[PDB]
Design a protein around this ligand. Structure first.
Ligand code: ZN
Ligand code: ZN
Ligand code: ZN
Length: 171
């Protein structure tokens, strides 16, 4: 053929994603990234409001632990709760890459998708924010729990990390 498969088939040149990539991604990412999730393949059909993020990554309801349907009727360990983390986390990637695509090409305009518009505003605040999980903006505080997952998790076999590492196979 006209080219070789070595950059994808040989471990001496293959440049795959690292566990620290997702931690820097939402802060300092360059305008030439290739992980950009497209609406034709992204599970955006499973979308939520920023307040429901607190149902899969828990925040205290009060000092007495006053339980609710989101913890007592349908616990955080349910398989459907994991789908909601995966689909929302993949959109934090889209919202950081979509804003960069417009910076790289002034002839086009960013998404009309309210979830993309929501997350790109949160990411541009969260990079300068100092309270994080304690921030008084519900959208900032909720997104910081998602960012805190990749910062503390180091496993290969995790219901959130495994499908992301499988999708980010940039060999
Ligand atoms: Zn977008
Ligand atoms: Zn904040
Ligand atoms: Zn994990």
């Amino acid at each position: 053929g006209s080219h070789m498969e070595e950059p994808q088939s040989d471990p001496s040149v293959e440049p795959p994603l690292s566990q620290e990539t997702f931690s820097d991604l939402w802060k300092l990412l360059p305008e030439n990234n290739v992980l950009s999730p497209l609406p034709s393949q992204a599970m955006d059909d499973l979308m939520l409001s920023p307040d429901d993020i607190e149902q899969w990554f828990t925040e205290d309801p009060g000092p007495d632990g006053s339980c609710f349907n989101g913890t007592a009727t349908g616990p955080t360990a349910d398989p459907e709760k994991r789908k909601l983390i995966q689909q929302q986390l993949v959109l934090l990637l889209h919202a950081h890459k979509c804003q960069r695509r417009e910076q790289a090409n002034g002839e086009v305009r960013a998404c009309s998708l309210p979830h993309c518009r929501t997350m790109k505003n949160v990411l541009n605040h969260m990079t300068h924010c100092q309270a994080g999980k304690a921030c008084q903006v519900a959208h900032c505080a909720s997104s910081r729990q998602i960012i805190s997952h990749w910062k503390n998790c180091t496993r290969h076999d995790c219901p959130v990390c495994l499908p992301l590492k499988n999708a980010s196979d940039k060999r």
